[PDB]
């Protein structure tokens, strides 16, 4: 997609292999915010959103939280508290063409700035003076979208780049997306290091005698800590007891 009208897709009910992207030497950049790029395979997400567009090389740096500029303000914006990875690579042999590829568009101006994850696909003529435009370009009347005109011989800052942004959503909600991990057998009445569909801790697991409502995934105590969990393969409830300790 053109950056002014960026695409979005949801990723769910799957195994997310992140090493396949991280260790791919074809990427020009792979920057993660809020998470290490090498720990992604060990994490679970509610879901993952993949945003996708083409931009010019000199403006790749605007696809980041806290940034300003023509893309950051009028085409695609990430929030200051963004959690996710921005991945990009050169497409000079795909998107650039002789005479210029004018199909990819960007918004150069707008009445006001975008909020995070907004999209503006309006074709309304922008007034930049006192006289109403009434849909016609001329002095003080301009159409807001510009073409890139990408060409094979442009210098690198003017070459096209393909950008994919993976936004990671984290909630108490059961993870619908997890990395390529293998399960183990469940054991009881031992002190273990555990991970239940992304929820971790150290403790002793026992069978509970309490009832969860059909939609509840885990429970908590008075201190708001994890009290119990629902096993993801066998839908049974286990209680978590801290491993014994004391002074000597």
């Amino acid at each position, epitope marked *: 997609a053109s950056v002014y009208a960026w695409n979005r897709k949801r990723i769910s009910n799957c195994v997310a292999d992140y090493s396949v992207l991280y260790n791919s030497a074809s990427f020009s950049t792979f920057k993660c915010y809020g998470v290490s790029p090498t720990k992604l395979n060990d994490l679970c997400f509610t879901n993952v959103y993949a945003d996708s567009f083409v931009i*010019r090389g000199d403006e790749v740096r605007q696809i980041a939280p806290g940034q300003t500029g*023509k893309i950051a303000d009028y085409n695609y914006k990430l929030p200051d508290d963004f959690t996710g990875c921005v991945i990009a690579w050169n497409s000079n042999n795909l998107d650039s063409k002789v*005479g*210029g*590829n*004018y199909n990819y568009l960007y918004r*150069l*101006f707008r009445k006001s700035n975008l909020k995070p994850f907004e999209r503006d696909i309006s074709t309304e003529i922008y007034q*930049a003076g006192s006289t109403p435009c009434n849909g*016609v*370009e*001329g*002095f003080n009347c*301009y*159409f*807001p*979208l*510009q*073409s*890139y*005109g*990408f*060409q094979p011989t*442009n210098g690198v800052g*003017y070459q096209p780049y393909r950008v994919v942004v993976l936004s990671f959503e984290l909630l108490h909600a059961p993870a619908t997306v997890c990395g390529p991990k293998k399960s183990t057998n469940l054991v009881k009445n031992k002190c273990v290091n555990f991970n239940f569909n992304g929820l971790t801790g150290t403790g002793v697991l026992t069978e509970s005698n309490k009832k969860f409502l059909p939609f509840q995934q885990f429970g908590r105590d008075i201190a708001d800590t994890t009290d119990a969990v629902r096993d993801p393969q066998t839908l049974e409830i286990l209680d978590i007891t801290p491993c014994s300790f004391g002074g000597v």
Partner: nanobody
Amino acid sequence: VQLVESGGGLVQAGGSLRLSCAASGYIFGRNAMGWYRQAPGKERELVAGITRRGSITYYADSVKGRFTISRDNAKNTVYLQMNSLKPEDTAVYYCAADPASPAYGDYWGQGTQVTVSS
């Protein structure tokens, strides 16, 4: 910044002069392009412009009766045909986006001097 101007020179008032410029796709792809001029001691002004879509043209009042602006997408170029030039039209002419501005990363080129004598 990725623009070259040409076609300037000294002419006697009357007749005509052809100005032209070439642009990279980056600039040629802008919503509109035109010609600007700056006379010594004056502010730079837009003389004429042509849009990318619809080939809509418009002119400053001072040149409506004698200038024609056009573009040719095949070569990524823009032209200004200035007919019936008068001494008042002496200025440096520049090729730039109709919304030209440093705010958008634009730069002015060298421009070309057009001088019109008695």
